[PDB]
Amino acid sequence: AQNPNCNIMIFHPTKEEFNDFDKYIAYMESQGAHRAGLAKIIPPKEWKARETYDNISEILIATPLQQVASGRAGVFTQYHKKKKAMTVGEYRHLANSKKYQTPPHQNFEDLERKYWKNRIYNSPIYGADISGSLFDENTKQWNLGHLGTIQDLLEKECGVVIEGVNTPYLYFGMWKTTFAWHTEDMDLYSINYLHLGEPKTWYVVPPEHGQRLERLARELFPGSSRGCGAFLRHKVALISPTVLKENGIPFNRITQEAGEFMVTFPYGYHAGFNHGFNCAEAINFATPRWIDYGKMASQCSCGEARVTFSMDAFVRILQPERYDLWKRGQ
Ligand SMILES: NNC(=O)[C@H](Cc1ccccc1)c1nn[nH]n1
Ligand SMILES: [Cl-]
Ligand code: NA
Ligand code: NI
Ligand SMILES: [Zn+2]
């Protein structure tokens, strides 16, 4: 078996290999990339997402989110307090202000130490889940607005036509903005391009070991676990690498820089943080190998994990026994 230790793999496709997206995902899996839960893809030197980022300041962040933490430095939850709308230009200025700017640091490891030591004592503001794309329409390779849709994948594999659409989202980050431990909706894949700005550090648990993370999370967040049998779906819980190591949880870490793609694989739990002002674009996608994961994906039915209406059809078709209860939750 390829990649038995479940290491994060890094790929350098040539321009020819960058033409057929599906084929390259399958190639990465043939090399065992999915065992880690996360892979990095460095685009060929000839490729670009768009010509410049000089004209993005008028994009609106309609509902910036202030990420307020509770708990201890290595084991905490965060809630999202809505703030007033601001443009990307205003957000960038805020990110670079003395209150929010990245501190002096020696290297990525120093900054990571500072993040886990100090994150809870600050409440950074995040632009998340903004429907849109920054790929030029003329970028033909790895354009996250032009991928095959999940609905078409389900139709091709299973023969059923379903409603729904699947479009990309933009994320504007600043120092300490945080993504909590989660898998994707219906344990889909995700792909993420860091268009501009400072890095993003990722943590990931191999899919084969996801239930180890779930068990630790139930121990560390006991009230949340009692409230919902799939509370990680709420996307609010953080556990540091130190705490994971103390509890023997298998995981890996990597830092993504501007111009790089990351793919998360079905049932690969991930979390992470932004180093400073940045902009990423992401979308969920499926392949034939996802279908078995979608059929088995846990679900939140307690009401907290509200999701797009395009998830209705996935639950309805792949998980008919669970559909009525999940629907009540929505
Ligand atoms: N599935 N979504 C996520 O992993 C995002 C983080 C994320 C956003 C862009 C590129 C890579 C990762 C998230 N989740 N909660 N806040 N942000
Ligand atoms: Cl700090
Ligand atoms: Na490892
Ligand atoms: Ni994700
Ligand atoms: Zn729930």
Q: Tell whether residue 192 is among the known ligand binding residues.
A: yes
List the one residue out of 151, 168, 169, 149 whose CA is nearest residue 160.
151
CA–centroid distance, residue 180 to ligand 5 (Å): 15
Q: Are 282 and 258 in contact (CB under 8 A)?
A: no
Which residue, by CA, sits nearest to atom 10 of ligand 1?
Answer: 192
Distance CA 108, CA 234 (A): 29
CA–centroid distance, residue 115 to ligand 2 (Å): 6
Q: Tell whether residue 126 is among the known ligand binding residues.
A: yes
* Experimental method, per PDB record: X-ray
Q: At CB < 8 A and 24+ separation, what contacts does 118-122 make?
A: 118/73, 118/176, 119/69, 119/73, 119/76, 119/176, 119/178, 119/238, 119/273, 120/69, 120/70, 120/71, 120/72, 120/73, 120/76, 122/176
Q: What is the dihedral of CA 281, 286, 289, 292, to 10 degrees?
A: 110
Distance CA 266, CA 126 (A): 25
Q: Pocket of ligand 1, candidates 130, 171, 285: which has the most ligand atoms within 8 Å of its Cβ, to mutate?
A: 171
CA–centroid distance, residue 36 to ligand 3 (Å): 9
Distance CA 323, CA 142 (A): 34
Distance CA 150, CA 314 (A): 9
Q: Is the CB of 263 under 6 A from ligand 1?
A: no
Q: Which domains does the chain have, with CATH numbers?
A: 1-330 (2.60.120.650)
Declared resolution, Å = 1.2
End-to-end CA distance of the chain: 40
What amino acid is encoded at 39 in this protein? A
Q: Is the CB of 78 under 6 A from ligand 1?
A: no
Burial-class residue 78 by CB neighbours within 10 Å (0-12, 13-18, 19+). Answer: buried
Task: Report DSSP letters for 20-46, one per residue.
Answer: -HHHHHHHHHHTTGGGGSEEEEPPPTT
Q: Tell whether residue 300 is among the known ligand binding residues.
A: yes
Kindly list the protein residues that place their beta carbon closer than 5 angstroms to ligand 2, a single-atom ion.
103, 114, 118
Q: Is the CB of 24 under 6 A from ligand 1?
A: no
Q: Residue with structure tokens 């898998």?
A: 183
List the one residue out of 58, 41, 16 whose CA is nearest residue 189.
41
Distances (CA, A) of 146 to 94, 142, 143, 285: 32, 8, 5, 11
Ligand nearest to the CA of 229: 5
Ligand nearest to the CA of 209: 3
Which residue, by CA, sits nearest to atom 11 of ligand 1?
Answer: 192
Q: Is the CB of 192 under 6 A from ligand 1?
A: yes
The counts of H helices and E strands in the chain are: 10, 16
The encoded tokens of residue 248 equal 């023997």
List the one residue out of 87, 89, 80 whose CA is nearest residue 124.
80
Q: Pocket of ligand 1, candidates 67, 80, 174, 192: which has the most ligand atoms within 8 Å of its Cβ, to mutate?
A: 192
Task: Report DSSP letters for 41-79, one per residue.
Answer: EPPPTT--S-S-STT-TT-EESS-EEEEEEEETTEEEEE
Mapped onto helix, strand or coil, the DSSP state of residue 203 is strand
CA–centroid distance, residue 295 to ligand 5 (Å): 18
Q: Are 168 and 195 in contact (CB under 8 A)?
A: no
CA–centroid distance, residue 253 to ligand 3 (Å): 8
Tell me phi and psi for residue 215, to 5 degrees.
-65, -40
